[PDB]
Design a protein around this ligand. Structure first.
Ligand SMILES: NC(=O)C1=CN([C@@H]2O[C@H](COP(=O)(O)OP(=O)(O)OC[C@H]3O[C@@H](n4cnc5c(N)ncnc54)[C@H](OP(=O)(O)O)[C@@H]3O)[C@@H](O)[C@H]2O)C=CC1
Ligand SMILES: NC(=O)C1=CN([C@@H]2O[C@H](COP(=O)(O)OP(=O)(O)OC[C@H]3O[C@@H](n4cnc5c(N)ncnc54)[C@H](OP(=O)(O)O)[C@@H]3O)[C@@H](O)[C@H]2O)C=CC1
Ligand SMILES: NC(=O)C1=CN([C@@H]2O[C@H](COP(=O)(O)OP(=O)(O)OC[C@H]3O[C@@H](n4cnc5c(N)ncnc54)[C@H](OP(=O)(O)O)[C@@H]3O)[C@@H](O)[C@H]2O)C=CC1
Ligand SMILES: NC(=O)C1=CN([C@@H]2O[C@H](COP(=O)(O)OP(=O)(O)OC[C@H]3O[C@@H](n4cnc5c(N)ncnc54)[C@H](OP(=O)(O)O)[C@@H]3O)[C@@H](O)[C@H]2O)C=CC1
Ligand SMILES: [Cl-]
Ligand SMILES: [Cl-]
Ligand code: NA
Ligand code: NA
Ligand code: NA
Ligand code: NA
Lengths: 307, 297, 297, 307
């Protein structure tokens, strides 16, 4: 299995590439950046190789800058990225530059979009690549859900892995926390002693702002997004067939909603999205999801016009 | 167990702290930096926590800038650092600021020095801290041997785990590769060029990329200590006569490492040339150590 | 950390000891049995050590028959055991023989009772040992819920990890399945037949095979404790008013478990019928506990 | 991946089956025993399933007693077994009963022989199955090597995984410890401080007798052999291509020796034995190997006559 990380010189891409190489299911990581960043990629390659020696693990680490260097990858991770609309237009052009026509040379490629705005760009990437709708996903609200898990786990003083929760919708201000799917040890939080003392609304506000707040303090998410990328790639390559909240193309599975890429619970395996789990949302949760799809659809239309 | 990472905002410290927190044996990581770095520490804490959530792992992450924030740690990882002698002088003063008198408040602390020149600064840390000689180690030539291992596994086109090499002495230009204890597939094995590359590799990666290798090496060492694994690792350690009667120096040697730190220096049999090279390396390191100690006096 | 397994020569004890030794957090396993079982203990020790070597793992394995061989363990796993009341009487006397006064010599010991009737014998162990109420637990209805989980995952043809159920109360015929806290894929969900199977499953497997399930459950509990993981697990624990004001009984309840043992009984909200069933189960368990305590007096 | 354990009701087979089910690379374990042991297999299946729930792992667990129940397995583990010659004859008949002609219905099967005498029966199984020479191996001296590792690790007070050693030849009294391949942390033991204080000959004597000594105390190896089986199956199914000492058919790779199955270092992967590593043996070590091949060859001839 070959995984190509486009934007491997960035904070996100370098850290993702280093953690992906440690996966037993990843036999090659290809580091892709623009031609002028070649020396940075050479240093990163050496450093990743050194981490692999320390971990007594194996991976071939290659570098490149052209379509032929990564088109044949099993998974292509798009982390390259630079006014919200102007940013979307600039990053949509990057998507197109790298992913246009991939389906023709590698119809079996799986693309994971990380570049923001991730829901819009997942749709762009899907359309320009020509790949099947199930083979292009975005990170979406998976990391937002993990950030919500942290806050909940800390409140109940439980191991973070004991908390199961889901946030769906836009990777942004219209994200929808799904309390009806939130549990501590399988126990619905509404039945947990102390859930009354948890300020859900403040937590959601913290999650919505965590990205820019981390950007203004540390300089941007790095280890969290790298581990989330690693978790998704592993789920795919090992064909684990587990449900994760990712930005995926909708074709009528939820509330008849169609023609958009947005964060939803999807079972993922070696062939990509195996199914959009139809999620049993409470009335107010379904309403919020609808408001979120509307925003993402309008933004998606603008980006498609631009390209 | 609590692990404090001093210099947690740097390239080495942040990556080490993030990988350390993933260890099941590490219940708490404390990120230490200077007062003006508080904002960075807070963002780093949030990002590491999110990474643990995504890994199905868990840890308490705290932050601080003051002695009382880290002195009670089980392991203190010193990665903070800024002419070679001017550099040694300034980094020695950083070690002294953070580690002087630690044994008075936490006699059972273990210190892992990563700041360079690491062999010199392991001795500095040992002396200022007051800790027993087995409780202060440095990460030195093991980093050099990891790179050498990568070259050997490539030559023989073998798995990484099938190559086992060892470099002792100074983490620097007097490093001693021990070909005597270098095997491929369990069987004893242009070395001069490979060594030349190994010596230059750190500045080579510095001039290109600017991390992950050192961070993973730190993680393996702390894990070996906290799980009392008793592995024979190459670390910078205080010598007290076990090898060739050599005393009063911290330098890269094979050492059996466990929860009590250095359980024993392992005196591997060296060919005559390997021993002579080690003795030269000790001389260099002793001289640099005397300068650093006199500078912080 | 040291884990002692009392009854290490039995089907449960030997398998538990072997799986416990594989844990990175377990540095030493002590196998305890009766004097006449010394030869078996020695063969078991060698076989577990070989299994660790084959797993690239490591542990110190010791053996004994006497109090001083295990009383200083961090965790003591009680699996030794031989009319229902006659059985309770004889197993209670075994608990008393091995665990009476442990708190006097090792106040920080944690006891995990597996011997049946486990809810009764958890109380017996707590009282004879003198240990604080949070340091003695039993493995009870969790075993019943594992089997229930297998039935649910089969019905919905889903992954095991996607099913989360919970059975509280007596590890026996008054067990209370908590459908309120049973989810599939994160979403809240012939139950009467499934329960009937669950209740009979232990005698069903006894009448066919004669182990691995209980051993793995024991391993998860000890790991949660020694790595201070703070997980909400169903264990037999002493109640002191957290659920419905109920006091002075050991019974299966949700509990946040860590290095200090039971950190808190978690009072999950029960539907009215679930609460009534729990109260009936407590009554049964209290009666059996009073008989056992009077029998060992 | 489907793994069938023949003799799953025994001490070896039950424990192997339980640990194999925990492997992520094992999706099905089929428990095979004689028809009259069906109720024992039903209880074992339930117990393994219960351990999988405790570990939050998945495996389908099936049971059977006929050729069609296991012939299609990816790996067939033969642990069923009952005067050394009379034992060999009886266990050779068991081998033949279960493995004759497997190549015709499943030419891609891999067989792991555990039944003793393992070197002889690996050859029997190879010949009766009709499978390619690289697809039938025996446990051989792999467990003897692990027992030697224990003794060495204890002497140096090091983690057992720090010790690398190899024993080759017969799984029996003519086994050959290969000190020239024995190291502590990559450091040859002859260069370790204290190797002079290690009584190699007593250690070897302990290894040679550990089997019967464990049989007379605990009742026979159980967890050790089960973990060694699990390690070999994982190496194969995950195509790890690592060198392990197993009983494998020799065709001239070592000292021109041919036409025997005996413990040797073999690189193992998804296609079975990828290569018999030609081992650089010291003079006295090569001599001992030769004496060992002679014993195993004579015993093999007797067993083939019998069947
Ligand atoms: N999904 C999520 O939740 C998150 C999304 N992101 C998104 O991921 C992307 C990467 O972020 P991050 O790595 O921190 O950013 P950095 O600025 O640290 O790295 C940028 C990366 O993009 C590449 N790049 C930038 N501009 C171009 C261009 N015009 N053409 C080709 N490559 C280009 C850079 O290559 P070079 O070395 O040549 O400059 C480098 O690899 C961003 O779009 C960001 O918004 C990040 C954080 C969270
Ligand atoms: N063992 C080895 O071979 C290797 C070790 N190293 C050594 O580790 C050290 C850190 O390198 P690296 O992280 O890459 O450097 P960075 O510049 O990326 O980070 C420097 C770190 O040191 C801290 N620091 C710098 N000056 C001082 C000071 N005067 N007082 C206190 N803290 C200070 C910084 O804190 P702040 O954010 O406040 O500036 C920050 O945590 C160096 O000594 C380096 O040589 C690195 C690579 C390999
Ligand atoms: N929590 C649960 O639901 C389950 C728990 N259990 C319980 O665990 C216990 C052990 O069962 P299991 O291992 O299968 O039984 P086995 O017969 O296989 O083993 C019995 C064990 O108990 C020891 N033992 C028996 N009698 C005495 C005694 N009078 N004094 C001291 N030690 C004694 C034996 O030691 P020796 O070798 O000297 O005889 C041996 O270690 C039982 O109480 C059983 O009910 C078992 C299964 C499930
Ligand atoms: N490679 C090594 O180092 C080791 C090899 N072994 C060998 O592995 C084999 C199994 O040992 P172990 O499990 O401890 O023995 P057990 O007696 O505990 O189990 C025997 C197993 O073989 C089956 N069996 C026995 N006779 C026959 C027969 N005539 N036809 C079909 N199946 C039969 C039994 O099935 P049923 O329930 O129907 O009786 C059961 O599954 C032995 O040959 C033993 O020598 C074991 C230990 C170490
Ligand atoms: Cl990292
Ligand atoms: Cl087991
Ligand atoms: Na890899
Ligand atoms: Na941790
Ligand atoms: Na262990
Ligand atoms: Na499995």
């Amino acid at each position: 299995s070959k995984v190509a990380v486009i934007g491997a010189t960035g904070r996100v891409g370098s850290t993702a590439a280093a953690r992906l190489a440690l996966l037993d299911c990843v036999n090659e990581v290809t580091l892709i950046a623009r031609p002028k960043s070649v020396d940075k990629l050479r240093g990163l390659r050496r450093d990743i190789l050194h981490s692999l020696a320390a971990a007594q693990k194996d991976a071939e680490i290659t570098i490149g800058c052209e379509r032929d260097d990564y088109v044949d990858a099993d998974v292509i991770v798009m982390t390259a990225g630079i006014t919200r609309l102007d940013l979307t237009k600039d990053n949509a052009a990057i998507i197109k530059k790298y992913l246009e026509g991939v389906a023709e040379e590698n119809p079996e490629a799986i693309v994971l979009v990380v570049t923001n705005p991730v829901d819009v760009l997942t749709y762009v990437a899907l359309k320009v690549s020509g790949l099947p709708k199930n083979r292009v996903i975005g990170l979406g609200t998976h990391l937002d859900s993990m950030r919500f898990r942290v806050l909940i786990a800390k409140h109940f003083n439980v191991h973070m892995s004991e908390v199961h929760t889901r946030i769906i919708g836009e990777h942004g201000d219209t994200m929808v926390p799904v309390i009806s799917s939130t549990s501590v040890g399988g126990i619905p939080v509404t039945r947990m002693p102390g859930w009354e003392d948890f300020d859900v609304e403040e937590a959601v506000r913290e999650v919505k702002e965590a990205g820019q707040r981390i950007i203004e303090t540390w300089g941007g998410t790095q280890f969290g997004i790298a581990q989330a990328i690693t978790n998704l790639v592993r789920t795919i390559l090992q064909d684990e067939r587990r449900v994760l909240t990712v930005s995926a193309y909708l074709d009528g599975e939820i509330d008849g909603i169609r023609d958009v890429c947005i964060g939803v619970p999807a079972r993922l395996g070696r062939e990509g999205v195996l199914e959009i789990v139809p999620i049993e949302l409470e009335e107010d949760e379904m309403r919020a999801f609808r408001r979120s799809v509307k925003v993402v659809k309008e933004a998606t239309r603008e980006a498609m016009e631009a390209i």
